[PDB]
Chain A
Amino acid sequence: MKETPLSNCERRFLLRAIEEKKRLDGRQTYDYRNIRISFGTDYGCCIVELGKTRVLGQVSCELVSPKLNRATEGILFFNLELSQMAAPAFEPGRQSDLLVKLNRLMERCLRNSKCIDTESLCVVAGEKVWQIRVDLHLLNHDGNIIDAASIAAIVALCHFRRPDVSVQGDEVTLYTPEERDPVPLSIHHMPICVSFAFFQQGTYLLVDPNEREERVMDGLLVIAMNKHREICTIQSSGGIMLLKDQVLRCSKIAGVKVAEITELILKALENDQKVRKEGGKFGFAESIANQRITAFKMEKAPIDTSDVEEKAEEIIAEAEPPSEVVSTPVLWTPGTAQIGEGVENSWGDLEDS
């Protein structure tokens, strides 16, 4: 199956809007759709919602032997993924020219910026070191997959907490959250992606576009830039043909937006740590809105486990015992034996000769 086609009335209406500098959902040009984060119970797991998009991030680490060369660092996998349920079009092996540009954007940003400290993830050299592995999934496609994926990866990496080890002399030991407290990571900076869309041959631009606005646009400009004033990647793409003042304007815009987004992320992580430290209840369950028609909650229930013995006993007692015709095995010659109705002759011989 494919996705519904685009009519010729919506295109005209969207372009009349864009000309008039008014958007569908009311938000003006330099705005984001507001954000809403939610944390799991075990560390390094979050659900970010930008507008109506969803991404699931989950970090996980493991101890391996560090290849050959680079004997004093650790490796860092990544794996974006697009879930068949995100949108009709996504198909497990039929959208192979978006996955590549997305994985590349994500990896170049996160791994070339050098914000994670992969220096201090060794135990010995030439021997076991930690191998982290980020994982993202797209749940609901409504445009701007990469801003949400980047914020998700950031939060998931800034909420993880490793295991921890004791090393002295030439001897290892591995603890557990009851034997020793999990340990945080070291994060230099916060690289946060921003996207721009261009409309009718660069004459207008719109920040943070959604999926209809994504189908009425010429090309896209992405500018990934960590906090302070330091750019980390740019990738023009789509169908665009650019000037030189516009890249600078865009860089300013991305500066502002990454400032605001980092503000938000820091505040949310702080609130989450405060909640976890007070001693209250946390998790995916205690996030479900209760003021809403589509939610229902039920505490525990002993059902009545008073009768199962009797029923099982009568059932076992009330049925026919195994019968008693026992079969015999036949021996032809050591190596082959037969059981069943058998064959008339011992074996065939000169049947046709």
Chain B
Amino acid sequence: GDHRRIRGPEESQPPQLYAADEEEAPGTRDPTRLRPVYARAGLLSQAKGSAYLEAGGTKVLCAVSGPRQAAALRGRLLCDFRRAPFAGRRRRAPPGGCEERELALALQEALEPAVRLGRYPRAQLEVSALLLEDGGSALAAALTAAALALADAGVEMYDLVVGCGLSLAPGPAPTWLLDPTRLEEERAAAGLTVALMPVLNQVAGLLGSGEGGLTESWAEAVRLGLEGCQRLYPVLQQSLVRAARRRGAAA
């Protein structure tokens, strides 16, 4: 198979497809709540900038490398999304996946409207994000963490990027929910993730697909996503303050 890795069995069917325990029932909740979030910046020592974001069942680690050699008059912004194989219900092929490339492009087309590349001619910035565990909305964590890492790496930006996520209930009276989990995401019909700049009040990225076809529900999904991105800001406000207070006092 692969001549650069250790070869095992050619085929391997996971026991979930043989799992005789029937799918359980998620439950119910209040759709006006947010999972408590703990954020830490400046984690890695060998990285120019890093941040670790954890909320409920989500664990994502992002690191930012400094400018390197090689629209110039402007610098590029390379991105790379990759999730740990021991994440989710099943295993994943190490070489890659189309979903990862889709999330990488959804990251690149969302973090460029924030940094000002007109200050790094002929240079480039590289951002790497890793998902240790998938326990809910993922693209709402690869944006917050990769934006905290950039601000902590001493690059000049217009503002931060704060993300959120939503999902649609499958009942006869569907209602959008805030911060869904895997028990509330695999039983859903549609999902939406927004990227709002809290001060400039400008939407950076939008993505959504599903079974909701009336152009009056998506207005609410968008504006409650904006309210979520306006409610996640203070925690990220005190995280970079603590990061700089600790980093500066070490000199």
Binding site for B on A (CB under 8 A): 352
**Chain B residues with CB under 8 A of A352:** 242, 245-246
What CA separation (Å) do A352 and B245 show in the bound complex? 9
What CA separation (Å) do A352 and B246 show in the bound complex? 9
**Chain A residues with CB under 8 A of B246:** 352
What CA separation (Å) do A98 and B35 show in the bound complex? 61
Give me 3 A-to-B residue pairs in the complex whose CB atoms sit less than 8 angstroms apart, sorted by A's number: A352-B242, A352-B245, A352-B246
Which residues of B from 216 to 251 have beta carbons under 8 Å from A? 242, 245-246
Report the minimum CB–CB distance from A352 to chain B (whole Å): 5
Size of the chain B interface, CB-CB below 8 angstroms: 3
Report the minimum CB–CB distance from A353 to chain B (whole Å): 8
What CA separation (Å) do A186 and B246 show in the bound complex? 80
Report the minimum CB–CB distance from B244 to chain A (whole Å): 11
**Chain A residues with CB under 8 A of B245:** 352
What CA separation (Å) do A352 and B242 show in the bound complex? 7
Select from chain A the residue with minimum beta-carbon distance to B238: A353
Select from chain B the residue with minimum beta-carbon distance to A352: B242
**Chain A residues with CB under 8 A of B242:** 352
Number of A-B contacts (CB under 8 A): 3
What CA separation (Å) do A352 and B240 show in the bound complex? 12
Report the minimum CB–CB distance from B132 to chain A (whole Å): 17
Which residues of B from 121 to 147 have beta carbons under 8 Å from A? none
Report the minimum CB–CB distance from B174 to chain A (whole Å): 40
Report the minimum CB–CB distance from B150 to chain A (whole Å): 22
Report the minimum CB–CB distance from B198 to chain A (whole Å): 22
What CA separation (Å) do A352 and B41 show in the bound complex? 13
Select from chain A the residue with minimum beta-carbon distance to B246: A352
What CA separation (Å) do A103 and B246 show in the bound complex? 64
Nearest first, the 3 closest Cβ-Cβ pairs linking A and B are: A352-B242, A352-B245, A352-B246
What CA separation (Å) do A311 and B242 show in the bound complex? 63
Report the minimum CB–CB distance from A4 to chain B (whole Å): 33
Report the minimum CB–CB distance from B200 to chain A (whole Å): 28
What CA separation (Å) do A313 and B163 show in the bound complex? 69
Report the minimum CB–CB distance from B120 to chain A (whole Å): 32
Select from chain A the residue with minimum beta-carbon distance to B245: A352
What CA separation (Å) do A352 and B248 show in the bound complex? 13
Select from chain A the residue with minimum beta-carbon distance to B241: A352
Report the minimum CB–CB distance from A198 to chain B (whole Å): 41
What CA separation (Å) do A85 and B242 show in the bound complex? 60
What CA separation (Å) do A352 and B241 show in the bound complex? 10
Report the minimum CB–CB distance from A135 to chain B (whole Å): 16
Which residues of B from 174 to 205 have beta carbons under 8 Å from A? none
What CA separation (Å) do A83 and B242 show in the bound complex? 59
Report the minimum CB–CB distance from B117 to chain A (whole Å): 33
Report the minimum CB–CB distance from B249 to chain A (whole Å): 10
Report the minimum CB–CB distance from B207 to chain A (whole Å): 35
Report the minimum CB–CB distance from A62 to chain B (whole Å): 15
What CA separation (Å) do A94 and B242 show in the bound complex? 53
What CA separation (Å) do A352 and B243 show in the bound complex? 10
Select from chain A the residue with minimum beta-carbon distance to B242: A352
What CA separation (Å) do A92 and B242 show in the bound complex? 52
Report the minimum CB–CB distance from A113 to chain B (whole Å): 32
Report the minimum CB–CB distance from B42 to chain A (whole Å): 12
Select from chain A the residue with minimum beta-carbon distance to B243: A352
What CA separation (Å) do A352 and B244 show in the bound complex? 11
Report the minimum CB–CB distance from A65 to chain B (whole Å): 12
What CA separation (Å) do A352 and B250 show in the bound complex? 14
Which residues of B from 15 to 50 have beta carbons under 8 Å from A? none
What CA separation (Å) do A352 and B247 show in the bound complex? 12
